[PDB]
Design a protein around this ligand. Sequence first.
Ligand SMILES: CC(C)(COP(=O)(O)OP(=O)(O)OC[C@H]1O[C@@H](n2cnc3c(N)ncnc32)[C@H](O)[C@@H]1OP(=O)(O)O)[C@@H](O)C(=O)NCCC(=O)NCCS
Ligand SMILES: *C(=O)CCCCCCCCCCCCC
Ligand SMILES: [Cl-]
Ligand SMILES: [Mg+2]
Lengths: 393, 8
Amino acid sequence: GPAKTMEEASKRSYQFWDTQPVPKLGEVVNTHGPVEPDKDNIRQEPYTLPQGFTWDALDLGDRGVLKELYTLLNENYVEDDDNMFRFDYSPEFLLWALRPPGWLPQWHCGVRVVSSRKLVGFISAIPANIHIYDTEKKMVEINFLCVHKKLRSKRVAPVLIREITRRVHLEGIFQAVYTAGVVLPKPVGTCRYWHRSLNPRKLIEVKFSHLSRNMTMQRTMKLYRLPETPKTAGLRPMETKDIPVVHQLLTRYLKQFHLTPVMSQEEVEHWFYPQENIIDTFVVENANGEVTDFLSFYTLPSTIMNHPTHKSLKAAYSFYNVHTQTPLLDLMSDALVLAKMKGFDVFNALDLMENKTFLEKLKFGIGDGNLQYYLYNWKCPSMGAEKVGLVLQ
Amino acid sequence: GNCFSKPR
Ligand SMILES: CC(C)(COP(=O)(O)OP(=O)(O)OC[C@H]1O[C@@H](n2cnc3c(N)ncnc32)[C@H](O)[C@@H]1OP(=O)(O)O)[C@@H](O)C(=O)NCCC(=O)NCCS
Ligand SMILES: *C(=O)CCCCCCCCCCCCC
Ligand SMILES: [Cl-]
Ligand SMILES: [Mg+2]
């Protein structure tokens, strides 16, 4: 029984989360710091799984194991509210998201059926330095918590969470950041997804979007039409020579927000250097040869379930967008043009950072999904979406 | 995990 709204959450018992070092939903936080001290001895044994299931760390450099994980998520990972769409993270995207600098094999935590070896559960941690108000902490980012549909409501997700917690504790890390579509104890920030149609005909045909209150299809196509080429002078894809300045621009830009990553130059290379069908980054190189702005978005398609003709939606997700000379509105306008050029059906963006300054103007429509942001074992006051400066995959 | 949203 997961809770999507805060109303349905207030009427919920959290048997598992009540046992965890996170604030309760009711309380308001007036302080900053760990919920509980660091542990100086850690459980050495993996947590017990139900009979017939076993832990297995997944070597994602093995193409067959990576494909098993692709399939687990492709068939059992997050769906929309109406069970019409499901994320379809590609194998090569999963490698990008799960092997950033400092990744550890034991943090790719799989569950298998003992007899068949079928992969039926997964959770992941990756290291990340996180800036939270006035504190910088080494943390992990938790992602890809997935339980096979046939294994659900058997309390496997709490075991996955305790096991990854244990394995992260063994490396001396006691805080984590993560997001969820559901409300849990206790969001540090609530962000709302917005959507910018790029191929409205397809979106309406697959019932991803619907025709607005008093609008025809022909009108909808004209409303969402875009230029063929971006307009910003000197926009071009990011190259290796840009890694330092992109790191510099990002670091300085993120200082205005209250929850942000702190990336090394190697992490900037990993997260932004373009990879086709995974991550796109375009820089603005001005008339003096200086990079002054950049935009980026990652590729995350979805499966269209039970549909005879259209099988997939290609979605771009706004990543980090840094402006110092080009107006953010123009940057995001060129982002839409580039996504359209690259075959995307929709461009998604959260209402975090300064995104509210362009969402409505660029004809984004509000979504039905909130993205809650959470910290494990860290108390701090909650913040508005515009102070959240962290984007995950 | 991420959240799958669609236009309200
Ligand atoms: C999310 C998922 C792993 C939960 O597993 P489940 O079998 O349905 O639920 P379980 O019986 O194992 O245990 C329920 C506990 O896990 C909690 N829980 C449910 N979803 C959670 C989530 N995304 N993150 C953390 N905890 C979650 C529940 O709140 C509950 O704890 P509680 O007693 O404190 O309320 C599973 O539904 C799934 O794989 N869904 C598709 C992919 C997905 O949603 N991944 C997580 C994205 S945030
Ligand atoms: C999406 O897949 C995120 C799901 C997050 C599940 C809860 C993770 C809680 C923190 C566990 C790690 C703690 C490390 C000290
Ligand atoms: Cl791996
Ligand atoms: Mg990183």
